[PDB]
Design a binder for this molecule. Structure first.
Ligand SMILES: Cc1cn([C@H]2C[C@H](OP(=O)(O)O)[C@@H](COP(=O)(O)O)O2)c(=O)[nH]c1=O
Ligand SMILES: [Ca+2]
Length: 135
């Protein structure tokens, strides 16, 4: 996998952010995780939804550099959102969320699962420390 630069446009929620990529505005959906819903009515505003959003926001807004890393399978989901691992000053947002108990490992679709084990170890640690979601 290779990282490429992107510029923040706006953080939408814990797992969705709008970025300028290759000179174009796009919405990215974080690969392999799911932060609680703050938007869809069919879901409501789930617990930690707001916390997860704040965490991501803070993380991307305060970063010097943002980078996107596409996996080896499809790069967009059926809604047209780019599917990537996003890094803030070299720190993976996807993992930071899981490590804090602010997201669960979800939507594992081969071959897009290069960092699945890594994300899975962080999640177990978050679970064993009973953080947020796991509290
Ligand atoms: C993360 C991810 C989500 N999606 C789809 C699965 C879900 O579709 P459905 O809308 O049918 O549930 C949705 C989850 O996104 P959200 O958490 O943003 O709702 O996005 C993919 O297709 N591939 C992915 O890699
Ligand atoms: Ca979500």
């Amino acid at each position: 996998l290779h990282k490429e630069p992107a510029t923040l446009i706006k953080a939408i929620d814990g797992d969705t952010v709008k970025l300028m990529y290759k000179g174009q505005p796009m919405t990215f959906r974080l690969l392999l995780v799911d932060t609680p819903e703050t938007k869809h009515p069919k879901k409501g505003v789930e617990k930690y939804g707001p916390e997860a959003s704040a965490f991501t926001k803070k993380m991307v807004e305060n970063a010097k550099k943002i980078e996107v890393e596409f996996d080896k399978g499809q790069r967009t989901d059926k809604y047209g959102r780019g599917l990537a691992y996003i890094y803030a000053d070299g720190k993976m947002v996807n993992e930071a969320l899981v490590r804090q108990g602010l997201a669960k490992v979800a939507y594992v679709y081969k071959p897009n699962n290069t960092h699945e084990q890594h994300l899975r170890k962080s999640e177990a640690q978050a679970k064993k420390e009973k953080l947020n979601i796991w509290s």
